[PDB]
Amino acid sequence: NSNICEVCNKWGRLFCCDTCPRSFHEHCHIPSVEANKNPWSCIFCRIKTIQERCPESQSGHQESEVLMRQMLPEEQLKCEFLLLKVYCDSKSCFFASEPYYNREGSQGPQKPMWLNKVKTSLNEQMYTRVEGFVQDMRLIFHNHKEFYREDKFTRLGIQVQDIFEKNFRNIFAIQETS
Template identity: 50%
Template sequence: MGGGGALPSPPSRKGKKKNTPNPQRTKRKLENSKQCTVCGQRRRLYHCTICRKFYHKRCHIPPVEVKRGLWSCVFCKTKDQLRCQENQARLKESEVLRWRMLPEKQLKCELLLLTMYCHSKSRFFIHKPKQNKADFPGLKNMWLNKIKYRLEKKAYHSVQRFVEDMRLIFQNHSIFYQNHKFNNLGVTVGGLFEKTFKRIFFN
């Protein structure tokens, strides 16, 4: 074989900058990844020191009252309580509905309502329905923000009153959108409520 045709030298790596982590860029990226678990918006967030999720003061139920120091969300506050509940005898719904709204029951209702707010399909039910009252005489409107206000003001004196208002939202929806495909949204979210209600209060 001839002496020509030498193999080409591999490309030189000289002068190439090595990618080094940029602390400022990493910090900015972390800041930008923070968003409220309920509404998805950023800025002025409080983080749970246990699960590390973020909430706005008014998005969390009940509203965040701490300014500094340790704070835990209602999901983490009730975790042990629900775990202990699993070993107890299953209650009937009629028994649960008769409960007075003591602090422990209030906390469970807050957990249930916050779970609903965190579900994307529940957003349709947050604000007052826009249906014309004249088309539905005698119908009592209900929506999530109204229930949230009543719960924060401790206006519910029993679990039954809270559950009745929640169910009223989906009962009304089935009337507003009777024989309409949009009725499925109320069925889906109403089913989520019933499933979560049983998990928190019964299991």
């Protein structure tokens, strides 16, 4: 196995996947690493199995159809993995925990949102459709853009949203367009 956490790139108390070389901190994996289960397969492995069992799941889809899907187990898993893909970027630190807002010339968002809140909402099965999860995720970046206005710090929201959007298109096999 790997000697660092796949998500945060630090050593520590690591749980090792049995079907690939990745390792994880307990709460870096999503879902949190399962208590028993020998062997244990990580989320990357579980996502790969879905594709292999239904090759046609990789043909192009329309975003509007994807968002209306019910959060059955496979969609739940895909949203977990997309969330994990954002935490994999170090710039996710800025959007992880509950923000606060006191900047001259700006007002905080009406509906604050952050990664750990989305993590909890997945864990607690609070989303009934993919649209719920994607809306909260895009809301994180949109709040940041509006609040920071012309400060160059706005760019951090563009950068992390780009990671989200590329991974969304990959994981849910969105039809490629020009």
